[PDB]
Amino acid sequence: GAYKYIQELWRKKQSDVMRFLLRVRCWQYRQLSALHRAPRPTRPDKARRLGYKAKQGYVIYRIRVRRGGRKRPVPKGATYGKPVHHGVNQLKFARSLQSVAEERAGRHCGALRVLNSYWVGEDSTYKFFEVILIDPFHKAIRRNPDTQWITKPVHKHREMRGLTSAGRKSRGLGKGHKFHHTIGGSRRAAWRRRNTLQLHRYR
Amino acid sequence: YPMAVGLNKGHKVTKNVSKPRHSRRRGRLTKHTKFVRDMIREVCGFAPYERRAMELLKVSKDKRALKFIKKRVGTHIRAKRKREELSNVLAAMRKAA
Amino acid sequence: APSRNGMVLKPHFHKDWQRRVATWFNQPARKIRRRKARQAKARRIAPRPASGPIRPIVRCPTVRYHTKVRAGRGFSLEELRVAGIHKKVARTIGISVDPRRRNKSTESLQANVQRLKEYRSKLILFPRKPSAPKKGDSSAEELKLATQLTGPVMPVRNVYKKEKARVITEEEKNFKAFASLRMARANARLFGIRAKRAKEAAEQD
Amino acid sequence: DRQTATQLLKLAHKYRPETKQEKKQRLLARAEKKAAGKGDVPTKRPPVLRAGVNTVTTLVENKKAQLVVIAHDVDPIELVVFLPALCRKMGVPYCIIKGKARLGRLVHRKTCTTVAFTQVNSEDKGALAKLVEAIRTNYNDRYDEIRRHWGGNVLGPKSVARIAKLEKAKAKELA
RNA sequence: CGGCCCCCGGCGCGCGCCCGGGUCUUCCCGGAGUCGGGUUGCUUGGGAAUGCAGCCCAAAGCGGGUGGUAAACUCCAUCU
RNA sequence: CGCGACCUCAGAUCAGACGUGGCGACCCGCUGAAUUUAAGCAUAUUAGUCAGCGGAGGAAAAGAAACUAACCAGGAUUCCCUCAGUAACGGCGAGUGAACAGGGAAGAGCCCAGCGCCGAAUCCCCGCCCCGCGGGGCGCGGGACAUGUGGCGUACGGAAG
Numbered sequence A: 001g002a003y004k005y006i007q008e009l010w011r012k013k014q015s016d017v018m019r020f021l022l023r024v025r026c027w028q029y030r031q032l033s034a035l036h037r038a039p040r041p042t043r044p045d046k047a048r049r050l051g052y053k054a055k056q057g058y059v060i061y062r063i064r065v066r067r068g069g070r071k072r073p074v075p076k077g078a079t080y081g082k083p084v085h086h087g088v089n090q091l092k093f094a095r096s097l098q099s100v101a102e103e104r105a106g107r108h109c110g111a112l113r114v115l116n117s118y119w120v121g122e123d124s125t126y127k128f129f130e131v132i133l134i135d136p137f138h139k140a141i142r143r144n145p146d147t148q149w150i151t152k153p154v155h156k157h158r159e160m161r162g163l164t165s166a167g168r169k170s171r172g173l174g175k176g177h178k179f180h181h182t183i184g185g186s187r188r189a190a191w192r193r194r195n196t197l198q199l200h201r202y203r
Numbered sequence B: 001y002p003m004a005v006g007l008n009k010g011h012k013v014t015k016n017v018s019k020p021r022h023s024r025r026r027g028r029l030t031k032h033t034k035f036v037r038d039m040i041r042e043v044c045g046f047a048p049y050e051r052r053a054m055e056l057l058k059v060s061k062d063k064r065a066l067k068f069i070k071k072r073v074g075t076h077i078r079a080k081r082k083r084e085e086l087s088n089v090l091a092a093m094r095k096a097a
Numbered sequence C: 001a002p003s004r005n006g007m008v009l010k011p012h013f014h015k016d017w018q019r020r021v022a023t024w025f026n027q028p029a030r031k032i033r034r035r036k037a038r039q040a041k042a043r044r045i046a047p048r049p050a051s052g053p054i055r056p057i058v059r060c061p062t063v064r065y066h067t068k069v070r071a072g073r074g075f076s077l078e079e080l081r082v083a084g085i086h087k088k089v090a091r092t093i094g095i096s097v098d099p100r101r102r103n104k105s106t107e108s109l110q111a112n113v114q115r116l117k118e119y120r121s122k123l124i125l126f127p128r129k130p131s132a133p134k135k136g137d138s139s140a141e142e143l144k145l146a147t148q149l150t151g152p153v154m155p156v157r158n159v160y161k162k163e164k165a166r167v168i169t170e171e172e173k174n175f176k177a178f179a180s181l182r183m184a185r186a187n188a189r190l191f192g193i194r195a196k197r198a199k200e201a202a203e204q205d
Numbered sequence D: 001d002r003q004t005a006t007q008l009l010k011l012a013h014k015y016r017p018e019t020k021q022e023k024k025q026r027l028l029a030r031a032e033k034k035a036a037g038k039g040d041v042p043t044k045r046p047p048v049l050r051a052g053v054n055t056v057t058t059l060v061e062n063k064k065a066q067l068v069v070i071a072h073d074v075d076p077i078e079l080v081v082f083l084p085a086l087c088r089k090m091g092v093p094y095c096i097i098k099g100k101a102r103l104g105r106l107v108h109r110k111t112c113t114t115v116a117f118t119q120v121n122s123e124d125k126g127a128l129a130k131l132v133e134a135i136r137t138n139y140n141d142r143y144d145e146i147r148r149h150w151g152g153n154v155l156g157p158k159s160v161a162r163i164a165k166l167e168k169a170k171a172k173e174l175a
Numbered sequence E: 001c002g003g004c005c006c007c008c009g010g011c012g013c014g015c016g017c018c019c020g021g022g023u024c025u026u027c028c029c030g031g032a033g034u035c036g037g038g039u040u041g042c043u044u045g046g047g048a049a050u051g052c053a054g055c056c057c058a059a060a061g062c063g064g065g066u067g068g069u070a071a072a073c074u075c076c077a078u079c080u
Numbered sequence F: 001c002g003c004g005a006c007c008u009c010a011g012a013u014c015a016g017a018c019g020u021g022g023c024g025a026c027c028c029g030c031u032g033a034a035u036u037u038a039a040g041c042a043u044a045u046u047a048g049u050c051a052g053c054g055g056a057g058g059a060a061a062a063g064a065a066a067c068u069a070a071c072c073a074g075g076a077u078u079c080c081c082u083c084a085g086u087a088a089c090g091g092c093g094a095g096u097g098a099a100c101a102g103g104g105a106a107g108a109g110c111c112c113a114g115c116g117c118c119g120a121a122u123c124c125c126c127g128c129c130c131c132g133c134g135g136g137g138c139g140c141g142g143g144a145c146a147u148g149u150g151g152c153g154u155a156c157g158g159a160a161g
């Protein structure tokens, strides 16, 4: 009953009530460290529609990410190559900033498993995401077979492999005519199969 | 005299009448959900572009109002739908008084 | 580099292709690896039929193939609804279900209902211990064989009609001609233009 | 004000919910007599005050609640902010009490953020109905005014003094 | 081929769990700084922009997406 | 002024867990050239490859349509044969270059937040036991979690009463 209002109130974040508390806390977030343990979700409807429950073993971090596109890491902007590759200053980094945010949360806490994350603020330079995490060895997680998929060792470091919903939006996969640059598995699995010379035994 | 090209094309079969699949009735308004959006737009208010829009939509003109809604909200099919529900607030503000 | 009368050619070997090479030397070895994965899957299951469930009659799309009949994916809940069996009961009866499939013709609807009831009338179930609801005595006297081969009800059986011989009569030798193709094709594209000029004489007053 | 919150917590005290100690013996006392008499209905009405924003919200828009105590210091304020606007339209009376910890002690918990009165006792209805006009004067009837009243916008005392020190000079600039 | 030693997947005594289907009647019914738009990069066979990303703007609810030539009107199909 | 509740946080060689590093043929995420080709060379090609960095698993990834189609319509993903050196891209030059039908290999489907309902009907820890081998429990009693929402029935193929 209540959570339908919290969803709909959040979906108007230019109105004067909502753009007040979206910057009284964006001030409050910016005074803290780069990553930081939240005691609770700051918007509980969004957390649980992404897989959060209010029980032992689940944990929320808000982490801070510096906005902007990437500069090419090269001394004095000299890239030493053909003139198409002088791109020092307009470069855009094909993985999203939220995916960067989930990555260095599961890199600090290498024991925790990462489920997904959501947006809770941006200023002009910093962008604030709440990343929700899972202890895979707590017995509230290692019981309950609706949660036992993530205590299975192929889900180790899902954002270093780009498997969560933040990171898979940059892999470019999906069904359709708009997405058949990656038509077996991934982008580099298609490339290997479009470019292998499949010479048969009788040919 | 059935034929392949023209204006009545194709092999003639007879249609199967069926109650449509439930996924297609997805964006209907479903009156409790109408209540949640209509209650919450008076505790929260209007965006800054759609307060400037409805102070062009009462005095200035309408072709310039939609030209302002064309730019901010994306397309033309979205700009008219926004322009007509700001006009239904502007009608309910003034003519329901 | 070119010479006398020859072919201008584009070999796509301008890329380092000797690393990405594929030789089929394990291909007899994998043919006897998936026969043994069929044999040890046939004897592992049951007297249940090998090569899985019953597939529907399905017609192909796309003008080139729409005159043939193909084995499909499931059974399109409407066909399960008319035949009388439940959607979650059906896949342990041996019946494939594809819920996203649509039936908008009636003849292709009634074909697979006839197929699905013909399957149920040639099926024998085994009760665990012999209670047998919807089922009677000895199992069709031990079911006449053990296990079938590459299709339970022969999934294609693309059949054509007889249409034996007719008499070249009047109104049949005289009308349905090449002029009917050219005029019907022209009215297909002169339809929207002629319905525009009619509006222009409707706003004529 | 604290004279009204004290009467309200007195009224909400004896409607205290079930805890797990008394949940044991009640499942005896129903079933030990069910082992002994098989009563078709032994208890007509166990009354309780509901707690939880997701519970209270369904009660208000169905108009089942009769008084909505609502907390003060909910950490994401948007969890609660619709509900004074929502109690007005559904005609259910609401009242803001001090401290989400204090009404959370009524429910044997830490915070509980909202409670509501649905089924009160009949003999004690005149204690629930005595304070409701003392409440809905200040919250429901004032909603045409409490929705206009902005907050904040006061300077610090070290800077609102030097505004006044300019004005006291300006009152001496005249007289 | 035989005999030996150890190990595995599956019948049958005790725990643990256990009202499904059809027809009608009413009520319920959904994921947002996301879609989308502009612009700039990289990428693609994708060409008046296939995908991705930055920044800016930013939704709707008979709505939204797609229908491989930009745009307006209109109808249909299809998915959610 | 004291005490209490909670909320934000600290500390500990606290009771108990976890993670780090290696290998890296295959797999996933990023990053990224130049030689070379164009008989010169910038776009293009080499090539989204080498090198670089980070994560796994015995497989990985993908996966149950915001799909293809445009007709009598098919129906998750992956692999193979064809489509096809085709549509298309390109100093339209050198070169590059998919997919959908179709035939096969294999085939399996589901769960949730929401919206409502059920007196939180739920879970974790500690203590002694029913009673046990090779140790995990349904039973009993205390501490917590949790109403800012655990659990059951429910998922768009509709669902509930």
Ligand SMILES: [Mg+2]
Binding pocket: none
């Ligand atoms: Mg905690």
Ligand SMILES: [Mg+2]
Binding pocket: A203
């Ligand atoms: Mg040959």
Ligand SMILES: [Mg+2]
Binding pocket: none
């Ligand atoms: Mg291993």
